[PDB]
Amino acid sequence: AEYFRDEGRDILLFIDNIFRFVQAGSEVSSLLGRMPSQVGYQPTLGTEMGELQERITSTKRGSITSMQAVYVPADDYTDPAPATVFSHLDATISLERSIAERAIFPAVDPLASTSRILDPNIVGEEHYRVAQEVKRVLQRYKDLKDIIAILGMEELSDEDKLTVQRARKIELFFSQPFTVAQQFTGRPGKYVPVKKTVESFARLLNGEGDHIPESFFYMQGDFDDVLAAYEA
Amino acid sequence: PHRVTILADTVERADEIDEARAEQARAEAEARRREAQSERDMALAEAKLRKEMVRLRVA
Numbered sequence: 001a002e003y004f005r006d007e008g009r010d011i012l013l014f015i016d017n018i019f020r021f022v023q024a025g026s027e028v029s030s031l032l033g034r035m036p037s038q039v040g041y042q043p044t045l046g047t048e049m050g051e052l053q054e055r056i057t058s059t060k061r062g063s064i065t066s067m068q069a070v071y072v073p074a075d076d077y078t079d080p081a082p083a084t085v086f087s088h089l090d091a092t093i094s095l096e097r098s099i100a101e102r103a104i105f106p107a108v109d110p111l112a113s114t115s116r117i118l119d120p121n122i123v124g125e126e127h128y129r130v131a132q133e134v135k136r137v138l139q140r141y142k143d144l145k146d147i148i149a150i151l152g153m154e155e156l157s158d159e160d161k162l163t164v165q166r167a168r169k170i171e172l173f174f175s176q177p178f179t180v181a182q183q184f185t186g187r188p189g190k191y192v193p194v195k196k197t198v199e200s201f202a203r204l205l206n207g208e209g210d211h212i213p214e215s216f217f218y219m220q221g222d223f224d225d226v227l228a229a230y231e232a
Numbered sequence: 233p234h235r236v237t238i239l240a241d242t243v244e245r246a247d248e249i250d251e252a253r254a255e256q257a258r259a260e261a262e263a264r265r266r267e268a269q270s271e272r273d274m275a276l277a278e279a280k281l282r283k284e285m286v287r288l289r290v291a
Contacts, residue, residue, distance in 0.1 A: 146281045147274060154274070 002055060005062040013056065015068040021052070022081040038080045045084050053088040091115035104175045104218075105185075110138050127194070130202045137167045169209050170201070173217040173226070190221025199223070 001011045015021070022045070029042030037043040056066040072082045093113050100107035120128045144160050147153075157164070179189025192200075200223035203209070209217065212230050220226050249256060262270060 146285070147277065150277060150281060151274070 001064050005059070005064050008062045010062060011064045013064050013066045015066065017071050018068045018085055019071045019073075019081050022049075022084065026081075041080050045080060046087075049084045049088060091117065099171075104172070105178065105181070106175055108174065110135050110171070110174065111141060123194075124198075126202065127198045130198045130205065133205045134170055134201055137163050138170070142167050166205070166209070168214060169212075169217050170204065172214060173200075173204065173209075173220070173223075175219050176221060177219055187219065190225065192221050196222050 001013045004011050022041070025045070025048050026041045029044070030036065030040070034043055037045065042048065053066075056064050058064070068085075070082060070085050073079055077083070077086075091114065094109045094111075095107040096109040096112075097107070099109060117123060118128060118131055123131075142164060144157070144164055147157075153161075176192060177187050177189045178185075179191070181187075182189050203223050208223070209226070212226065216229055217226055220229060266272065
């Protein structure tokens with residue numbers, strides 16, 4: 001990847017199971033006679049991570065963006081390998097089984113998917129504002145689901161009905177057609193720039209998405225595409 | 233001869249409040265609902281919910 005970066009071309013580098021890289025380092029150190037550190041891990045854990053992750057950076061001539069996959073042993077995030085991996089992370093994406101099984105193909109959970117770029121001084125005031133209005137109605141994970149479950153929605157929830165409708169609309173709208181799955185699901189893929197995303201979600205939270213039922217925000221690129229589908 | 237008692241089942245018109253100027257009765261139900269019926273019915277249901285859901289999680 002660094003060859004092409006030196007050529008000036010932006011590169012997307014995927015590392016599958018960087019935790020396995022940590023484990024390989026641990027085994028190499030154990031076989032090399034080095035004393036173990038923490039839970040049997042190599043003493044040179046931080047430096048070994050630095051010598052690899054620091055090459056993934058954006059210089060002036062080019063950039064190497066990385067999208068790694070991390071496997072945590074059991075569910076222990078206190079483990080030294082996930083901790084050292086996370087010390088070199090800028091964003092996390094948490095694909096969820098429930099979202100995947102609800103026919104929404106991009107299973108990126110709106111919650112549990114953070115980023116350090118999501119602040120006004122880089123993305124912009126509007127982007128941060130729209131990203132905060134969304135994920136706020138979902139901040140509860142629609143905790144209203146339990147009250148519906150044990151109350152039959154109580155036959156009336158006032159505003160909660162509107163916030164539930166908006167949250168469901170946004171959850172459906174997060175899906176996007178895949179240009180690589182176009183030959184599988186028979187649907188052209190739409191590429192949505194960040195400006196289109198922020199404008200569409202700003203309008204949806206303002207309320208232009210209202211008066212439109214579900215299954216119309218299921219699988220579309222822009223809010224303009226949703227409007228075109230609605231009028232047709 | 234000395235005291236009069238009216239065990240009336242219900243009272244309606246009352247020059248004290250009547251329909252116009254009536255205040256006590258106004259929001260009186262909420263005064264005996266938000267902390268009694270309305271909201272509180274859900275308020276105690278939320279206690280049942282969040283407690284029940286964590287009851288299996290501790291098992």
